[PDB]
Amino acid sequence: STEIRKAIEDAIESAPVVLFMKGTPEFPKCGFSRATIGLLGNQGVDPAKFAAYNVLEDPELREGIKEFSEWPTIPQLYVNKEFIGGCDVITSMARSGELADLLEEAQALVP
């Protein structure tokens, strides 16, 4: 819908690093959403350059981001408006070091 597409665009432009997740950073849903929040914390992502949105109680946004990203699972990471991936990709990139490089180059890490 017009509203959902606008919502998604607004969400992804709201910060250099954006996470669609189950729960919130304060109350993250156990499982892959909480793990991914912790992973981003360990990476040193600057909270001032980060935004997260809870799809867990927002069925329209949940379905919307899955269609938009062409990816069916949550959480999903966007950096500078680009889809980076769901959890497997995020975690793999963290392990290999591509995530750190990406976040550094996006100037999204704490000083």
Q: How far apart are CA 50 and CA 37, in angstroms?
A: 11
The CATH fold assigned to 7-106 is Glutaredoxin (3.40.30)
Dihedrals φ, ψ of 15, to 5°?
-160, 155
Mark residue 97 as left, alpha or beta (left: phi above 0; alpha: psi -120 to 50; beta: remaining): left
Deposited experimental method: X-ray
- In terms of Cα–Cα distance, which of 48, 50, 60, 59 is closest to 24? 50
Supply angle C-alpha 62, 65, 69, rounded to 5.
145
Instruction: Find out whether 62 is annotated in a ligand binding site.
Output: yes
Instruction: Find out whether 63 is annotated in a ligand binding site.
Output: yes
Instruction: Find out whether 81 is annotated in a ligand binding site.
Output: no
Instruction: Find out whether 95 is annotated in a ligand binding site.
Output: no
Q: How far apart are CA 58 and CA 14, in angstroms?
A: 18
Asked whether the beta carbons of 74 and 62 are under 8 A apart, the reply is yes
Instruction: Find out whether 5 is annotated in a ligand binding site.
Output: no
- In terms of Cα–Cα distance, which of 111, 110, 105 is closest to 43? 110
Instruction: Find out whether 57 is annotated in a ligand binding site.
Output: no
| Domain ranges (residues) in the chain | 7-106
Resolution (angstroms) stands at: 1.7
Longest dimension (CA), the chain: 39
